Short mmCIF file of C-alpha atoms and ligand atoms in Angstrom, two decimals:
data_model
loop_
_atom_site.label_atom_id
_atom_site.label_comp_id
_atom_site.label_asym_id
_atom_site.label_seq_id
_atom_site.Cartn_x
_atom_site.Cartn_y
_atom_site.Cartn_z
CA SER A 1 -127.95 87.51 -108.98
CA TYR A 2 -128.67 88.61 -112.30
CA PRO A 3 -130.23 91.97 -113.39
CA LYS A 4 -133.81 93.09 -113.51
CA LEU A 5 -135.20 92.65 -117.16
CA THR A 6 -137.22 95.54 -118.76
CA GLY A 7 -139.64 95.42 -121.56
CA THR A 8 -142.79 96.72 -123.14
CA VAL A 9 -145.79 95.89 -120.77
CA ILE A 10 -148.39 93.52 -122.48
CA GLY A 11 -151.55 91.98 -120.96
CA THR A 12 -155.21 92.47 -120.45
CA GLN A 13 -156.59 96.03 -121.46
CA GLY A 14 -158.57 98.10 -119.08
CA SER A 15 -159.48 97.99 -115.07
CA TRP A 16 -161.98 97.34 -112.75
CA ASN A 17 -165.04 99.87 -112.77
CA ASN A 18 -162.55 102.03 -115.22
CA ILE A 19 -160.95 102.99 -111.70
CA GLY A 20 -157.52 103.18 -113.67
CA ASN A 21 -155.69 99.92 -111.87
CA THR A 22 -154.49 98.64 -115.14
CA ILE A 23 -151.66 96.35 -115.78
CA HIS A 24 -148.97 99.01 -115.42
CA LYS A 25 -149.70 99.26 -111.77
CA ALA A 26 -147.80 96.02 -111.48
CA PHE A 27 -144.43 97.57 -112.80
CA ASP A 28 -144.35 100.64 -111.11
CA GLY A 29 -142.24 100.02 -108.15
CA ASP A 30 -144.95 100.53 -105.41
CA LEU A 31 -146.08 97.50 -103.68
CA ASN A 32 -149.41 99.41 -102.29
CA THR A 33 -150.63 99.80 -106.22
CA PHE A 34 -152.37 96.96 -107.80
CA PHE A 35 -153.66 95.51 -111.25
CA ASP A 36 -157.37 95.22 -110.75
CA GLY A 37 -158.35 93.38 -113.88
CA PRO A 38 -161.87 94.52 -115.69
CA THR A 39 -163.20 90.78 -115.35
CA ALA A 40 -162.91 88.20 -112.85
CA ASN A 41 -161.35 85.71 -115.15
CA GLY A 42 -158.76 85.40 -118.05
CA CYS A 43 -156.52 88.55 -117.00
CA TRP A 44 -152.94 88.22 -117.34
CA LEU A 45 -149.83 90.73 -117.91
CA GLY A 46 -145.89 90.47 -118.56
CA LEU A 47 -143.33 91.90 -121.12
CA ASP A 48 -142.23 91.39 -124.54
CA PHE A 49 -138.60 92.21 -124.24
CA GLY A 50 -138.54 93.30 -127.98
CA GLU A 51 -138.05 91.87 -131.50
CA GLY A 52 -134.81 90.05 -131.55
CA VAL A 53 -134.37 90.02 -127.81
CA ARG A 54 -134.62 86.70 -125.84
CA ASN A 55 -133.77 86.39 -121.99
CA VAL A 56 -132.83 83.46 -120.10
CA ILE A 57 -135.01 83.85 -116.94
CA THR A 58 -133.37 83.04 -113.46
CA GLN A 59 -135.61 84.63 -111.07
CA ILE A 60 -139.35 85.74 -110.43
CA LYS A 61 -140.42 88.40 -107.88
CA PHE A 62 -143.86 89.15 -107.12
CA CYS A 63 -145.89 91.00 -104.35
CA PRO A 64 -149.80 90.31 -103.88
CA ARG A 65 -152.39 92.98 -103.59
CA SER A 66 -152.57 93.79 -99.93
CA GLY A 67 -155.76 92.09 -98.34
CA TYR A 68 -156.26 89.83 -101.80
CA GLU A 69 -153.24 87.57 -101.63
CA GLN A 70 -155.65 84.41 -101.98
CA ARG A 71 -156.02 85.86 -105.34
CA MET A 72 -152.83 84.51 -106.51
CA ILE A 73 -153.01 80.88 -105.76
CA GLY A 74 -152.74 78.91 -108.76
CA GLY A 75 -151.30 81.45 -110.83
CA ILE A 76 -148.75 80.60 -113.20
CA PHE A 77 -145.53 82.30 -114.93
CA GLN A 78 -144.85 81.46 -118.36
CA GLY A 79 -142.17 82.03 -120.97
CA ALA A 80 -142.85 82.13 -124.82
CA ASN A 81 -141.38 83.05 -128.05
CA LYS A 82 -145.12 83.66 -129.61
CA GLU A 83 -147.10 86.62 -128.32
CA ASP A 84 -150.22 84.31 -128.03
CA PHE A 85 -148.11 82.24 -125.79
CA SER A 86 -149.23 78.95 -127.73
CA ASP A 87 -145.60 77.51 -127.50
CA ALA A 88 -145.42 78.76 -123.76
CA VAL A 89 -143.66 76.82 -120.80
CA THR A 90 -144.89 77.02 -117.11
CA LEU A 91 -141.72 78.46 -115.46
CA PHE A 92 -143.45 78.57 -111.88
CA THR A 93 -146.87 77.81 -110.28
CA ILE A 94 -147.95 79.68 -107.09
CA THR A 95 -149.09 76.93 -104.55
CA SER A 96 -149.02 78.75 -101.05
CA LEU A 97 -150.46 81.94 -100.14
CA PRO A 98 -148.02 84.74 -100.90
CA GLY A 99 -146.69 87.18 -97.87
CA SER A 100 -148.54 90.52 -97.76
CA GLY A 101 -146.34 93.47 -98.43
CA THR A 102 -143.26 92.08 -99.96
CA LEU A 103 -141.72 90.39 -102.88
CA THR A 104 -141.74 86.71 -102.94
CA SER A 105 -138.41 85.57 -104.75
CA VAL A 106 -138.44 82.17 -106.57
CA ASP A 107 -135.63 80.83 -108.42
CA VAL A 108 -136.31 79.55 -112.44
CA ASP A 109 -134.36 76.64 -114.00
CA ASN A 110 -135.17 76.65 -117.53
CA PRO A 111 -132.21 77.53 -120.22
CA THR A 112 -134.47 78.68 -122.86
CA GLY A 113 -134.43 82.32 -123.91
CA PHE A 114 -137.45 84.03 -124.15
CA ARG A 115 -139.09 87.24 -125.89
CA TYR A 116 -142.19 87.02 -123.76
CA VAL A 117 -143.07 86.50 -120.32
CA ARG A 118 -146.20 86.87 -118.15
CA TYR A 119 -148.21 86.03 -115.21
CA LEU A 120 -151.40 84.36 -116.23
CA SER A 121 -153.98 84.60 -113.08
CA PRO A 122 -156.41 82.07 -111.62
CA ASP A 123 -160.32 82.38 -111.99
CA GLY A 124 -161.75 84.68 -109.56
CA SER A 125 -158.74 86.51 -109.27
CA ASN A 126 -159.38 89.80 -111.67
CA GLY A 127 -155.78 89.28 -112.20
CA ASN A 128 -155.03 90.57 -108.80
CA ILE A 129 -151.14 91.55 -108.22
CA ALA A 130 -149.07 94.38 -106.84
CA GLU A 131 -145.56 94.01 -108.37
CA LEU A 132 -144.08 91.84 -110.85
CA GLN A 133 -140.38 91.47 -111.67
CA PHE A 134 -138.34 89.19 -113.93
CA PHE A 135 -134.60 88.51 -113.56
CA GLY A 136 -132.06 87.07 -115.93
CA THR A 137 -129.57 87.41 -118.68
CA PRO A 138 -129.56 87.76 -122.69
CA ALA A 139 -129.66 84.13 -124.21
CA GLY A 140 -126.07 83.04 -125.65
O1 LIG B 1 -165.24 91.64 -108.11
C1 LIG B 1 -163.90 92.26 -108.17
C2 LIG B 1 -163.65 93.13 -107.26
O2 LIG B 1 -163.44 92.42 -105.96
C3 LIG B 1 -163.56 93.21 -104.77
O3 LIG B 1 -163.51 92.41 -103.53
C4 LIG B 1 -164.62 91.89 -103.28
C5 LIG B 1 -164.51 90.43 -102.91
O4 LIG B 1 -163.60 90.23 -102.07
C6 LIG B 1 -163.29 89.22 -102.11
C7 LIG B 1 -161.87 88.85 -101.29
O5 LIG B 1 -161.94 89.77 -100.06
C8 LIG B 1 -161.00 89.40 -99.02
O6 LIG B 1 -161.18 90.88 -98.23
C9 LIG B 1 -161.43 92.25 -98.24
C10 LIG B 1 -163.03 92.53 -98.22
O7 LIG B 1 -163.56 91.82 -99.34
C11 LIG B 1 -163.15 93.87 -98.46
O8 LIG B 1 -164.38 94.60 -98.38
C12 LIG B 1 -162.17 95.01 -97.20
O9 LIG B 1 -162.32 96.06 -97.77
O10 LIG B 1 -160.76 94.41 -97.26
C13 LIG B 1 -160.69 92.92 -97.32
C14 LIG B 1 -159.35 92.59 -97.08
O11 LIG B 1 -158.66 93.54 -96.24
C15 LIG B 1 -160.65 88.30 -98.76
O12 LIG B 1 -159.59 88.43 -98.08
C16 LIG B 1 -160.08 87.68 -100.14
O13 LIG B 1 -159.48 86.26 -99.82
C17 LIG B 1 -161.46 87.54 -100.92
O14 LIG B 1 -160.77 86.91 -102.20
C18 LIG B 1 -161.47 85.94 -102.61
O15 LIG B 1 -160.81 84.81 -101.80
C19 LIG B 1 -161.44 83.39 -101.80
C20 LIG B 1 -160.90 82.48 -100.64
O16 LIG B 1 -160.97 83.09 -99.49
C21 LIG B 1 -161.34 83.00 -103.25
O17 LIG B 1 -161.92 81.72 -103.64
C22 LIG B 1 -161.51 83.81 -104.25
O18 LIG B 1 -160.94 83.62 -105.60
C23 LIG B 1 -161.13 85.54 -103.87
O19 LIG B 1 -161.72 86.16 -104.92
O20 LIG B 1 -165.76 90.05 -102.72
C24 LIG B 1 -166.18 90.39 -101.40
C25 LIG B 1 -166.47 92.02 -101.49
O21 LIG B 1 -166.79 92.62 -100.16
C26 LIG B 1 -165.16 92.85 -102.07
O22 LIG B 1 -165.46 94.04 -102.71
C27 LIG B 1 -162.13 94.21 -104.95
O23 LIG B 1 -162.21 95.15 -103.83
C28 LIG B 1 -162.49 94.90 -106.19
O24 LIG B 1 -161.17 95.77 -106.12
C29 LIG B 1 -162.43 93.96 -107.38
O25 LIG B 1 -161.20 93.28 -107.52
CA1 LIG B 2 -147.43 98.21 -108.11
#
């Protein structure tokens, strides 16, 4: 069990109908609040750990938006060292319906240190996710 990682929130700007459910809702510790993106497709969110910081990721936890759990199926989590994710590797792919109102935990087995991590949502999802957490350790 490694510590929860912190960083600068990055990702799709804005929110559905300008209501205010931005990417920041996925990092607030409340499983009742969620990111609702401004478009059906293309939405993503994640962390920049900072210039010169690289973490090895050992675990990811996520909670779907209540009532919209199907919108996570096919979503993937990536690590990268470029902010445009052109060097990204997939750390986990969501293949079954995540349980409602809880954090699903998945192990990651990849020794690479990453400056950036993200959740990349599937078409038709508006990026819907309630909470997103990364765990791991500074790269040696
Ligand atoms: O367009 C973005 C916009 O979507 C808004 O939701 C609309 C959308 O809902 C689809 C979604 O509905 C679930 O159920 C909702 C119901 O639609 C609501 O009216 C009601 O109040 O709550 C229930 C749940 O308690 C389904 O359970 C979801 O699975 C479903 O999502 C889709 O699932 C299919 C597979 O079944 C998948 O292929 C799609 O990709 C996925 O989208 O459409 C119906 C409208 O009534 C909804 O308004 C959403 O509320 C809003 O925040 C914004 O995200
Ligand atoms: Ca939340």
